[PDB]
Amino acid sequence: GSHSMRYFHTSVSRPGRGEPRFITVGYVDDTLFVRFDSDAASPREEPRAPWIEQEGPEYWDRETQICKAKAQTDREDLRTLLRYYNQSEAGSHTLQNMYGCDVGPDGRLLRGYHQHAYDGKDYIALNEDLSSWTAADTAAQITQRKWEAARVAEQLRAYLEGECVEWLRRYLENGKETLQRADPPKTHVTHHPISDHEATLRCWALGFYPAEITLTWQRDGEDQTQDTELVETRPAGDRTFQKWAAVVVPSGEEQRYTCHVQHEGLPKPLTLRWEP
């Protein structure tokens, strides 16, 4: 029912190897829909989902102009940040920015985001109010003073409450076949002997969309959080995701263990056990 649109941007400097590489991608929920890479032979924003292909040339021209301009401002920003941190011009550095909006079932703004990181560390973020800033350090306070003076937050609020939510509504409708379809996990339990004394039970969730899922093991009805190996949810490459959770079970105890699965495509949570 709830949805999100996010744009991600990364610039990475490479002194002596030309200008910083800029890569930006856009997502609705867990679906990639646009990309731009300054190292492409002829950089243009390109479609990555079928429902964005119908946007006309004016959209692609505008988006491409925005991406090219952002690549250039990021290069200026990388030069500025070397000054703010008293750094030399010899090393590679990273500048990241994410922004976008979350909406609920009725399409209304739930919250907006616009935040930056430098060298993998939080730098400055627009607060949930869309009106004030959180700066991580005294360098970012210099940016905060500039952005307060220029009323940047007001510009971001206008976009996040307005255009961002309106684009997301449009995309959700044009992409209603897929963006508004949850694919439930296909689930099963496997058993993997380790020694005469114990075996692994592995609970699998495959083919699901969106990525959010909860997979847990209980023993005699008690959660086994500390003893569960839970891998990161991972992309299958066909739009869907995979996950598994594994516990080490003493011989003969297998029926005391239950795997529990929660996903928005399931009308009710599932309980599974090993079935020899």
Partner: peptide, 9 residues
């Protein structure tokens, strides 16, 4: 669709 506001640190 993207934000079109140039913003420099």
């Amino acid at each position: 669709g993207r934000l079109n506001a140039p913003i420099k640190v």
